[PDB]
């Protein structure tokens, strides 16, 4: 529905999805096909 | 928290001559008319 991002999508199934995953009955590792959002200070080095 | 989300635990009984299963099927029915975003699970005892 054009809501959400490829990056919308990634943070929730990384903040929702991947841990009760990574728990399941004769589940190993579990590989993320993107990233969880994390709070990005995008530094100026002109203002800073 | 229960399986990595916020929880809160309820403890409670089946009223005399009920089954327990009987007793849950109730709290089911009752936890799906809550708000959005509010979901359950069965743990100790409810779940073996």
Same mark, same amino acid.
Request: charge should be negative.
């Given at each position: 529905?054009?809501?959400?991002?490829?990056?919308?999508?990634?943070?929730?199934?990384?903040?929702?999805?991947?841990?009760?995953?990574?728990?399941?009955?004769?589940?190993?590792?579990?590989?993320?096909?993107?990233?969880?959002?994390?709070?990005?200070?995008?530094?100026?080095?002109?203002?800073? | 928290?229960?399986?990595?989300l916020?929880? /809160? $635990?309820?403890?409670? %009984?089946? +009223?005399?001559?009920?089954?327990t =299963?009987?007793? /849950? $099927?109730?709290?089911? %029915?009752? +936890?799906?008319?809550?708000?959005? =975003?509010?979901?359950?699970?069965?743990?100790?005892?409810?779940?073996?």
């Amino acid at each position: 529905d054009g809501t959400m991002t490829q990056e919308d999508i990634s943070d929730y199934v990384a903040a929702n999805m991947k841990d009760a995953i990574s728990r399941t009955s004769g589940v190993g590792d579990v590989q993320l096909f993107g990233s969880q959002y994390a709070m990005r200070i995008w530094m100026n080095p002109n203002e800073l | 928290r229960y399986n990595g989300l916020p929880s /809160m $635990e309820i403890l409670g %009984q089946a +009223a005399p001559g009920k089954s327990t =299963g009987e007793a /849950m $099927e109730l709290m089911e %029915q009752l +936890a799906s008319k809550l708000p959005t =975003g509010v979901g359950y699970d069965w743990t100790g005892m409810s779940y073996q």
